[PDB]
Amino acid sequence: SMKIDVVTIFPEYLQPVGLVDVAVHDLRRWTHDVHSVDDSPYGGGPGMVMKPTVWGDALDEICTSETLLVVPTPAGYPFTQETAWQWSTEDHLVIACGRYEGIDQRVADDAATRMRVREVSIGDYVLNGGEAAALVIIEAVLRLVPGSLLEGPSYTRPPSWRGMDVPPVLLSGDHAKIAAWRAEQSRQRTIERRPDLLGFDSP
Amino acid sequence: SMKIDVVTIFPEYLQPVRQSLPGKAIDAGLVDVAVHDLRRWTHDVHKSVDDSPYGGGPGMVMKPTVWGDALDEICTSETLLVVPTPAGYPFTQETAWQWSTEDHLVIACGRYEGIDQRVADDAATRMRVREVSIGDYVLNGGEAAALVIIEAVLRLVPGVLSLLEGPSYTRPPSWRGMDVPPVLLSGDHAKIAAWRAEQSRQRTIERRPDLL
Numbered sequence: 001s002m003k004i005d006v007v008t009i010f011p012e013y014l015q016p017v018g019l020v021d022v023a024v025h026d027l028r029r030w031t032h033d034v035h036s037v038d039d040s041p042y043g044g045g046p047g048m049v050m051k052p053t054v055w056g057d058a059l060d061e062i063c064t065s066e067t068l069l070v071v072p073t074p075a076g077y078p079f080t081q082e083t084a085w086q087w088s089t090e091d092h093l094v095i096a097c098g099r100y101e102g103i104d105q106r107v108a109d110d111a112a113t114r115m116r117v118r119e120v121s122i123g124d125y126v127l128n129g130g131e132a133a134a135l136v137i138i139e140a141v142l143r144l145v146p147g148s149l150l151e152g153p154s155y156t157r158p159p160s161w162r163g164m165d166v167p168p169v170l171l172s173g174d175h176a177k178i179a180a181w182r183a184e185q186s187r188q189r190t191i192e193r194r195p196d197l198l199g200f201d202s203p
Numbered sequence: 204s205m206k207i208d209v210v211t212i213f214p215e216y217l218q219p220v221r222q223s224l225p226g227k228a229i230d231a232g233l234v235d236v237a238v239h240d241l242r243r244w245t246h247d248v249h250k251s252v253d254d255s256p257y258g259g260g261p262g263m264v265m266k267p268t269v270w271g272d273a274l275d276e277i278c279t280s281e282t283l284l285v286v287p288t289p290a291g292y293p294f295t296q297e298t299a300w301q302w303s304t305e306d307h308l309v310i311a312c313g314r315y316e317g318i319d320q321r322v323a324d325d326a327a328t329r330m331r332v333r334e335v336s337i338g339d340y341v342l343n344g345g346e347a348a349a350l351v352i353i354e355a356v357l358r359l360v361p362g363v364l365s366l367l368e369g370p371s372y373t374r375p376p377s378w379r380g381m382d383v384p385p386v387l388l389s390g391d392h393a394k395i396a397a398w399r400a401e402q403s404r405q406r407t408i409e410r411r412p413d414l415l
């Protein structure tokens with residue numbers, strides 16, 4: 001059993017969500033001011049940084065000492081399939097979705113004193129916020145909840161379509177020849193598309 | 204000006220993007236995002252999108268017949284076809300920059316064990332096709348991958364929306380026993396830049412040693 005809490009300033013983005021309960025929290029519910037979640041960065045620079053004070057009160061109410069705090073960030077550790085397996089057995093996940101240029105560092109540092117904190121990246125691209133990354137994390141984790149190489153090409157009926165035939169080995173019904181072909185196709189694809197997985201230089 | 208078409212069996216998954224778009228960008232004709240149900244192009248009364256894999260195996264493969272019809276109607280010869288897949292080329296920031304100047308993007312969102320390979324192969328004979336992965340993890344479909352692709356591409360299109368970045372700080376100067384690093388309040392902007400560069404290198408060594 002697992003509980004996932006997602007904290008964000010845009011709770012509407014998280015709308016695409018027995019054994020698991022998923023709750024979305026608006027961060028602006030923890031502001032006592034009439035107007036603000038963001039302020040200018042110390043030391044200068046572009047954009048805005050999310051204030052630590054608002055995040056502190058939100059995570060104090062939601063998180064326990066057993067909580068694993070997930071902070072999506074482009075500067076984080078790589079979130080992989082290995083990470084997804086490690087997180088699928090967790091009791092409580094809190095995903096802190098940032099916006100603007102990110103969250104004040106002291107939020108992750110403060111939470112690390114009472115709980116386990118993971119700053120993670122889902123890929124080498126920049127998103128506008130952690131909301132999209134949260135949806136990626138949730139999907140990757142939840143499909144592994146109890147209850148190595150690139151995948152080869154997949155085919156289904158008809159056997160001939162638009163003048164393109166399904167590879168005749170798959171129709172033959174020879175399990176040993178099918179497995180040998182599929183392994184060949186997977187290894188040829190991994191060389192071409194992701195040579196790093198087999199231990200070669202990226203293009 | 205950019206048109207994005209998304210084809211999926213779950214069109215409700217792509218509600219975040221359409222909601223997150225500002226009205227000013229749509230009214231100026233900079234962006235038009237349209238979501239299409241794949242079951243519009245089904246042939247049978249049961250509205251079948253999937254069928255059993257050739258050569259055995261677990262799970263199901265999405266039908267080439269239904270997908271072929273959908274792409275014939277939506278795609279032109281100037282279309283760049285984006286097909287999210289765990290076995291694809293890596294989608295990076297460089298990939299996002301290249302696609303930000305494109306006129307027509309069609310994202311084909313698969314489910315089950317993926318789409319019949321002949322769909323992309325047929326499309327490759329008359330248009331540019333990109334099979335892409337957003338990371339080294341497996342999702343249930345291409346819908347979450349599409350939201351990632353759309354957000355990354357569109358934020359680089361103006362008005363629509365290397366080492367690792369160091370720690371960022373804001374008000375207050377003191378919070379829960381932690382002070383903002385005094386260098387950031389010194390007024391020595393040469394020293395700040397050098398401090399930020401060192402923090403960037405330290406974070407890169409610790410978190411992403413592959414980039415060095």
Ligand SMILES: Nc1cc(-c2ccc3ccn(Cc4ccccn4)c3c2)[nH]n1
Pocket residue numbers: 072073074075097098099100101102103120121122123124125126127128129130131133368
């Ligand atoms: N793998 C990832 C993670 C992210 C991500 C996660 C959370 C936030 C909150 C804000 N931004 C924007 C932003 C812009 C400039 C520098 C830092 N951050 C985020 C981006 N994108 N791609």
Ligand SMILES: Nc1cc(-c2ccc3ccn(Cc4ccccn4)c3c2)[nH]n1
Pocket residue numbers: 151287288289290312313314315316317318335336337338339340341342343344345346348
């Ligand atoms: N970087 C990526 C891409 C995907 C992705 C994209 C599209 C589909 C359509 C179906 N599945 C599930 C599935 C499971 C087992 C083998 C093949 N596919 C998808 C997964 N996940 N992570």
